[PDB]
Structure formats: structure tokens, C-alpha cells
Q: What sequence folds into this?
């Protein structure tokens, strides 16, 4: 089997992407944030504290003939940005782009943090990291991909995120028309439960490539590119007037700037992030200070190849017995 679904930016900045997901019988379609940095599929629901719902579409398990309470199971997750959610668990039928999993754990939120409430466009998350990170207790549950894997034509999914435009998540096949040149594959460590890999270096604009190992995660659920302070300083040094602002919470730059590109290495291959992808616009409405899309990972504890990086590539998440990651230009 295969599946193919379009993923759409939630706003003009590409802060996140939503993908429609069918849950239950008859189908209830929710728009979920596919997150290769976590491993829970959770939804706003009829059980979510009413004051914490503001415009989201909810899953109502009592209206699904295939929903079953997973007795005794609870979940609770905290994300890198400080947001969180928790609740109980149902199993139900879940379909993505024509690919159907029966008995998928659907984690129903009883509580969500303010960041989730305040984002009316995201109805939940669909985790695509390794199932070892799943938070359901006392019986850990599998991700949608893990459950689908054996049925897929090939044990892979691909992320093809757009810049200020829709893109695609495919399951079970590699669309050879969706990228240019060849896909370069690189080793993955699953030791931390992430799609963790090592970039071979970077360049800023038309500058020379610096060969240096950068360990990080491919994370569709993180907006920006978070890299070591040395790398980030070298980038922003090429933008007149750019500075790190502790009050704002990262590097800012004059909105009048033309940003240089940023290249990262994948083996001997190179992925080029155009400068415009690194512009996250005014820090507040009407400001002439703009927020940068490359930020320091110092004190995150890990480097994160988030959407800024991934949307410059066609990315293969290869879930074979020994997982790997592939990157192509597009």
C-alpha cells in the first residue's frame, strides 16, 4: 500500500504545516501537524477542557463506531518549545492520503497548553519519530508509520515541504518526479528516538564550504534551523545590522536586508537554503526588525534541522531495519 497527502503552511511565515487526517467511522477529518521529532498522535477532542478549545476541529470518539477506549492508558507530553498536552487514549481507524491503519492509538487531549489553544489551525500532532519516544503509559504505543510499515510497498515516508506553498507527505514510495538529481543517503542513530544524523558541514552565501560534523535531528515539527553558536554567528556576520537580541530571544536583522543563502552538507552532497527561507518577518506588527530563521542551538542540547532546512530538500525517512535519511535538491 501507499498514501499521499498534501501538507499546507498554517500561515504566511510557514510556522508549521497541517495535513488532513481521517479518524474514525464515519471519518472525522482533523488537520494535524506531522512531527518527525515526536511519537504521539494526539488530537483536540470532545474531552478537551472547554476553555482550552478555541476554533480547533475536535475528535469525538463516541461518534465513531470503530473507536475503543484503551483502558487505563494515559499520556502526557512536553515539547521543546515549552508547550504540552495530556489525556487518555482510544484506538481507532486512521487514514492518511488513502493509507489506512486500523487499531491506531489516538491520544485524546483532556488538557492542552496555551500555545495549542491559541493556534486554531492545528487540531493535533501526528508523530513520526521512533516509537520508543511514545508517551502512553503503562503500555507504550506505536506511531502511525510504525503500524503501517509492514503493509507499505517500501518502508519509507517522504517529506516535501513547500516554501510559502503546499507540499506533500508520501508513505510507501519515493516519487522520482519530485526532486532533481540524486538522493544522497546518510546514516541515522535512533539512540535518542529521533531521526538523528550528521551533516558534513556548511557554507554561508557564496563562501567556501567548511567541512565539520554537525550532529542533529530532522524535525518537521520545528519551524527553524537550530545550529551551533559558531555556525550561526558566521551566518549572521554576513548580514549588516544583524545581532542577537536577548530581549527578543534570538538573532534579528534589519527587514531591509537581503539575506544570504545557507548550504548544509549531506555526505558529499549539498543542500542550499535560499536566503528568503531564512526571513521570518517583523518581530511584531509594523517593526523594521525581522526575526531570523537560523538560530543557536546552545542550551537546547541538540541541533535541529527544522522546516527552514527541510523545505529546501526532498527528504526520505527510510524506516528499513537499519534506518537512514535521504536528501535531494528539488
A:
Amino acid at each position: 500500500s501507499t498514501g499521499s497527502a498534501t501538507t499546507t503552511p498554517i500561515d504566511s511565515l510557514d510556522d508549521a504545516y497541517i495535513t488532513p487526517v481521517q479518524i474514525g467511522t464515519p471519518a472525522q477529518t482533523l488537520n494535524l501537524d506531522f512531527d518527525t521529532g515526536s511519537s504521539d498522535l494526539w488530537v483536540f477532542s470532545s474531552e478537551t477542557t472547554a476553555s482550552e478549545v478555541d476554533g480547533q476541529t475536535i475528535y469525538t470518539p463516541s461518534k465513531s463506531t470503530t473507536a475503543k477506549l484503551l483502558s487505563g492508558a494515559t499520556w502526557s507530553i512536553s515539547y521543546g518549545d515549552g508547550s504540552s498536552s495530556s489525556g487518555d487514549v482510544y484506538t481507532d481507524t486512521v487514514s492518511v492520503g488513502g493509507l489506512t491503519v486500523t487499531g491506531q492509538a489516538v491520544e485524546s487531549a483532556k488538557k492542552v497548553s496555551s500555545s495549542f489553544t491559541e493556534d486554531s489551525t492545528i487540531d493535533g500532532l501526528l508523530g513520526l519519530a521512533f516509537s520508543t519516544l511514545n508517551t502512553v503509559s503503562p503500555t507504550q504505543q506505536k506511531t502511525f508509520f510504525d503500524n503501517a510499515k509492514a503493509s507499505l510497498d517500501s518502508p519509507v515516508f517522504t517529506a516535501d515541504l513547500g516554501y510559502h506553498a503546499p507540499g506533500t507527505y508520501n508513505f510507501g514510495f519515493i516519487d522520482t518526479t519530485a526532486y532533481t538529481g540524486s538522493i544522497t543517503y546518510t546514516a541515522v542513530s535512533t539512540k535518542q528516538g529521533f531521526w538523528e544524523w550528521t551533516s558534513t558541514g556548511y557554507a554561508v552565501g557564496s563562501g567556501t564550504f567548511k567541512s565539520t560534523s554537525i550532529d542533529g535531528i530532522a524535525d518537521t515539527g520545528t519551524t527553524l534551523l537550530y545550529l551551533p553558536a559558531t555556525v550561526v554567528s558566521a551566518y549572521w556576520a554576513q548580514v549588516s545590522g544583524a545581532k542577537s537580541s536577548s530581549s527578543v530571544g534570538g538573532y534579528v536583522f534589519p527587514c531591509s536586508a537581503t539575506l544570504p543563502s545557507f548550504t548544509f552538507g549531506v555526505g558529499s552532497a549539498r543542500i542550499v537554503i535560499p536566503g528568503d527561507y531564512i526571513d521570518f518577518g517583523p518581530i511584531s506588527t509594523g517593526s523594521s526588525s525581522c526575526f531570523g530563521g537560523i538560530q543557536s542551538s546552545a542550551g537546547i542540547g541538540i541541533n535541529i534541522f527544522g522546516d527552514v532546512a527541510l523545505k529546501a530538500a526532498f527528504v526520505v525517512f527510510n524506516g528499513a531495519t537499519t534506518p537512514t535519511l535521504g536528501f535531494a535538491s528539488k
User: Anything to note?
Assistant: The two ends are 25 Å apart (CA to CA). Residues 47 and 110 are 5 Å apart (CA to CA). The chain has two domains: 5-174, 175-330.
